[PDB]
Design a protein around this ligand. Structure first.
Ligand SMILES: [Ca+2]
Ligand SMILES: [Ca+2]
Ligand SMILES: [Ca+2]
Ligand SMILES: [Ca+2]
Lengths: 612, 13, 148, 627, 67
């Protein structure tokens, strides 16, 4: 049984219980002459309810029934104080459903009887979830704020709905407006709710009340990507200095954008958010001028210093791999299985030359250049979420997997030395092809190489994997068919399929037209091979390899615009990475402060635009 | 964008 | 009946379901008060029944979908437009429900030869869609064609 | 003579017979003073007709002539009861053509004389066909329903047109509305015709009267893809429970969609229909939530169990092919025609090892794994149509051809063994490249591999074949020209074209830049070869092979949207395949029934949507109500 | 042999048992980039671009060809 199948049956069982009683049937049908004749004689215990646990006032309010509600409130006014009792609808009273349908007179008639305007609705159908279609919170002021009805909202402030009240997730009513779909109405409901804000409060203002995970409402708009609510929160943080004709010089507050002393900054929560619309906050007019000033002034030369420190490091690593302690081998290679052609074994433990002491100082750079990576990449695993860190592809993404797997393999070949292990060649060669293709991480600092290296990432996951599943299917069918027809053949004259591992390798190489088609014109190849080869030349290297260029040629311009605003979210996310990692000797605090230009201690930033 | 609607305007004319 | 707008009936059929979202059978005057209060209009009691007994022809104060087409033929008093794009709207639409839709507009750029991506054809609708339902109306098709 | 050329001459011969008589000429010209002077004296036998067999009332009704009709009805009222008699217009009376032109008064004047409102029009120009432009059926109530004229329709119910009457194809009048082009008018004619429906009938209601192939009208909309008529048939099958603000919880009936006990289900007839618009029913709001709930809850793990059962099976088949009974050969290969290099023959019949008894238990899996395919794919040939099954490419398509040709070749190599046939290598190697490329059938269960393997199908038929016809033309021209210039050359130093079969093979390999260009720099190649090669390097592997990447690069985004809604019709069509094949221990009946939540025994499904409370789509309609 | 190298038909002429002149390898890295990286793949790009420009022109040119 699925949980969607549980609530589907309760909402149908509610319909059977409504047909069960004449009261609840008359509650929803407005037949007042079937209402009035009932509750005059034998005044029932109205505790008889639906399976949702809802009174006759709830059923008469779930439908727009003004009259059938008020008749049930006259003879029983204690129905207004009762909640629903089933586990997905806990706490939904009659005021909530009256607010939800925007029944204006039904709010007044319930408010005249003293309905509890702070009744929390803690049902499993009210919480924020990917399964519930609307998240409105718990308090009925929040139910009125997120329907875009200003008359119900003014009606609950006069009867004492505490505006600072927050639900089980910690969201106040100004948070739940930011999670709404209709983004242009909640901006106007922000102006309505702050006009009723508590004047000279002891605690912070309502624009700064945090969440149960620490999100200010201004910080929540940057996470959810509510760009319309971001510009209405920046209305109270700009001070228009002068308008000298067409120009306008505004002065942004930048205290809650920059967020100088904080662990999880505002810009850290925006560039790491799972919402795809979260990247659009990094193009709004106080943030676009902020993270570009952080990038052009400090962030780009402090990256190029780091990008040139690493390519100088990797050159020192390969130069210590090319020179590696190899001695001549004495075990007369044509005696043991003369197929093999080894002629250099290793050195056991010997550095006694002069041109290898300069190699050991280079090796020691690679060991301390690997452990720095395992000191600057290991604590970053746990503060983002250990899988949100390896898979967000905005803040590094699949380069932190590479930079750690590389740095382990330099600390693995150190264990292969100092113990005289024989297989030194295995972790070194994986360390080069992971070490050099991690220089590709520093391509994000350049507009020439930035958006292209996102496309290599967007094809090696979305498009190379959907091709290579469809070729492991195919080239297993032809490598098997090539090992069949050349098992009975002589491997001395045509040895391209001597073994089944080589048959899987020579069939993969043929598909990419790397190896020539295996043909020896001085012998007679079996005719079954040529029939299987003409199909392999058509299915693999006519159709499939050229459909790959077609498909990758098609899904390049589909995500050519997506790759462009993903790199602009990548130069921001490396700035916020670099402002956090580098010491505060570097990166002075961005903005012009106001301790000398006296208007406070907040750090301001000036943006001068030319509007036509 | 508005560029696409100017082609559908053109093709009926 | 002889109002003769085949694509406005498919607009009215969606429009009639808006008023009659409450219940399956037709308009019940509290089902109009439900959608009037959704706009915050707050109409007075016993002014709803008057507002329906001046559209209703056949007694039985509930108004139905044939009677709904009578009133909207009387309003939107009359337009004698070029009639050529009204022919072109029905060939751009291949399901014939009077809405162009989200995907069928991409299905014509693919045939007209325009390399247009999925987001940009979605951008074409958002400019064209006044009621913002994601599918352009025939009237939205006219206002995006001959108005300029 | 073509059949289109036969009816073209009859419709011109009708014009000669109209010029033949002054009556029929005055029938269509409305010249009443040439009418009245004629039939006053020598009242003719009006049995003189056109070659269509049509009376003077028919000619005066085929044109909009009110007056010339009624003058011919006064002096001869028996013209109203006569049909046309030629073999493509059998049964078309004067009421039919009056209905067709929507001549309102001509229907009343014919109905006042007792015109037969049940006259079947069984002509060869009235039946449903790809050659006839409109299919309206037979009865004249059906002729009035499919012209979108409500006044003629109300006029025939009052004079007793039987609404349940069905034509020669079995289509009632509610069927022929669904086959109409103007889909938005027939929805409103469905509401008109059910308002005249027979109250408390003994048989079923008119929404459930079947066809002569078994199609309910609700089932016919899913076949023809009439998505507008599908949503108007779902108006009477939903029960709106509550509207809690913006949400709405409707409860769909799901009896005629799911169709639990039936051989040919509703969803089987939709995903197998030849109409391209038939796939759009699988995106409507009660069906989209139904076949996704059948797919996510049961259909996707019951496919992945089956997708992993087959790849485990094919690994066991190749492992029994790689290990195969080969012994050393004794016939001293350099003695018979030393070009040949065979050195393993076969084993005659010998399994006596230990590492081959574990091979025979693997072989036996392949024989019983092949005959299961020939037991689960052979009865499915005849119930779809034996060519509709192999070529619909929504329900498998060109994988059932592969899965049977593979399974035959495992049952063919079993005949190659047990008889000591020598050519065992031939049906095994076709069995691998057909057996492994049938794992590609199970790519439709995954969104990563689903839409791509439709594109390999849409290029290997539409686009690889239009290229490979244009290369068998080309590479025959250069393989012939390469066998000419190297027939006189020495095959011992450059043997790439020693034989004409190898010349056709080495020219095909050069085109794909697989084999290197055949050149031996220690000898002098003939100069005629280098001139033919520079053209072969330009025509084949500059122009043609790179135009292939251009053309396939062009016809990829043309059908990138077509491949996306073809895979969504492919995950549905494998669910309906899997609900039918798998036993009913698996797949419990989808939906919430109503035997405990009491409203019937029908099996219901709940869909809760969030429609936006945008005011602009409502404010225009509440202002036409207020003012 | 230079026309054949450009089309990647003939393998790159290299004999690993002898020492090729160093001037050849410098001229070859430019010939591997200008001819068979840039030019041969720009050909697939250009022909890939001027295919859908005249895909509608080629369609009503064949209907004038069956007539
Ligand atoms: Ca109703
Ligand atoms: Ca009425
Ligand atoms: Ca449409
Ligand atoms: Ca619209």
């Amino acid at each position: 049984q699925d949980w969607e199948q549980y609530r589907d049956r309760v909402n149908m069982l509610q319909q059977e219980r409504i047909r069960d009683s004449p009261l609840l049937q008359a509650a929803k049908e407005n037949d007042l002459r079937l209402l009035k004749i009932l509750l005059l004689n034998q005044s029932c215990d109205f505790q008889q309810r639906g399976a949702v646990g809802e009174t006759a006032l709830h059923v008469a309010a779930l439908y727009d029934n003004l009259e059938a509600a008020t008749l049930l409130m006259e003879a029983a006014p204690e129905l207004a104080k009762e909640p629903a009792l089933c586990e997905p609808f806990v706490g939904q009273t009659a005021l909530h459903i009256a607010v939800m349908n925007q029944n204006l007179n039904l709010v007044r008639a319930l408010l005249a009887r003293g309905a509890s305007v702070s009744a929390r609705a803690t049902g499993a159908a009210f919480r924020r979830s990917p399964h519930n279609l609307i998240y409105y919170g718990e308090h009925p002021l929040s139910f009125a704020a997120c329907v875009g009805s200003e008359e119900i909202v003014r009606l609950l402030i006069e009867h004492g709905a505490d505006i600072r009240a927050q639900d089980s997730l910690g969201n106040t009513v100004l948070h739940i407006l930011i999670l709404q779909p209709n983004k242009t109405f909640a901006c106007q409901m922000y102006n309505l709710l702050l006009s009723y804000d508590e004047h000279s409060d002891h605690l912070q203002s309502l624009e700064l009340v945090p969440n149960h995970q620490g999100l200010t409402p201004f910080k929540l708009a940057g996470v959810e990507g509510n760009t319309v609510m971001f510009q209405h929160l920046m209305q109270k943080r700009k001070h228009v200095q002068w308008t000298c004709g067409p120009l306008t010089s505004t002065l942004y507050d930048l205290t809650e954008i920059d967020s100088w002393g904080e662990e999880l900054s505002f810009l850290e929560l925006v560039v790491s958010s799972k919402k795809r619309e979260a990247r659009q906050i990094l193009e709004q007019t106080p943030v676009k001028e902020l993270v570009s000033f952080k990038w052009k002034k400090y962030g780009r030369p402090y990256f190029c210093v780091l990008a040139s420190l690493y390519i100088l490091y990797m050159i020192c690593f390969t130069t210590c791999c090319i020179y590696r302690p190899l001695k001549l081998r004495d075990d007369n290679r044509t005696d043991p299985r003369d197929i093999t052609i080894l002629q250099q074994k290793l050195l056991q433990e010997a550095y006694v030359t002069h041109q290898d002491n300069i190699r050991l100082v280079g090796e020691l750079v690679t060991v301390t250049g690997a452990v720095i990576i395992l000191l600057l990449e290991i604590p970053d695993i746990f503060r983002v979420g250990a899988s949100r860190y390896f898979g967000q592809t905005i803040l590094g993404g699949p380069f932190h997997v590479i930079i750690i797997t590389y740095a382990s393999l330099v600390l693995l070949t150190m264990v292969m030395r100092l113990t005289n292990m024989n297989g030194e060649v295995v972790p070194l060669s994986f360390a080069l092809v992971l070490g050099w293709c991690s220089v590709m991480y520093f391509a994000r600092g350049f507009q020439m190489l930035g958006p292209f290296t996102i496309m290599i990432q967007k094809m090696i996951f979305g498009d190379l994997m959907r091709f290579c599943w469809l070729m492991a299917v195919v080239i297993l069918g032809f490598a098997s068919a090539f090992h069949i027809t050349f098992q009975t053949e002589d491997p001395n004259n045509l040895g391209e399929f001597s073994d089944y591992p080589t048959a899987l390798f020579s069939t993969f190489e043929l598909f990419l037209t790397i190896i020539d088609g295996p043909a020896n014109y001085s012998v007679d190849l079996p005719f079954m091979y040529c029939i299987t080869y003409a199909a392999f030349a058509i299915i693999a290297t006519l159709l499939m390899l050229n459909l790959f260029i077609a498909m990758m040629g098609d899904t390049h311009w589909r995500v050519a615009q997506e790759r462009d605003e993903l790199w602009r979210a990548q130069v921001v996310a490396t700035t916020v990475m670099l402002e956090r990692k580098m010491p505060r000797f570097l990166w002075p605090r961005s903005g012009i402060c106001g301790y000398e230009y006296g208007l406070g201690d907040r750090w301001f930033l000036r943006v001068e635009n030319h509007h036509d | 964008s508005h560029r696409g609607w100017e082609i559908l305007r053109r093709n009926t004319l | 009946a002889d109002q003769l707008t085949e694509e406005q009936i498919a607009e009215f059929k969606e429009a009639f379901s808006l008023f009659d979202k409450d219940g399956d059978g037709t308009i019940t005057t509290k089902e109009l008060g439900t959608v009037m209060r959704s706009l915050g209009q707050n109409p007075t009691e016993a002014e709803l029944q008057d507002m329906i007994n001046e559209v209703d022809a056949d007694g039985n104060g509930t108004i139905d979908f044939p009677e709904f087409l009578t009133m909207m033929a009387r309003k939107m008093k009359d337009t004698d437009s070029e009639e050529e794009i009204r022919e072109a709207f029905r060939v751009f639409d291949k399901d014939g429900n009077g809405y162009i839709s989200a995907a069928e507009l991409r299905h014509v750029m693919t045939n007209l030869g325009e390399k247009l991506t999925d987001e940009e054809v979605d951008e074409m609708i958002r400019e064209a869609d006044i009621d913002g339902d994601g599918q352009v109306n025939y009237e939205e098709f006219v206002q995006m064609m001959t108005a300029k």
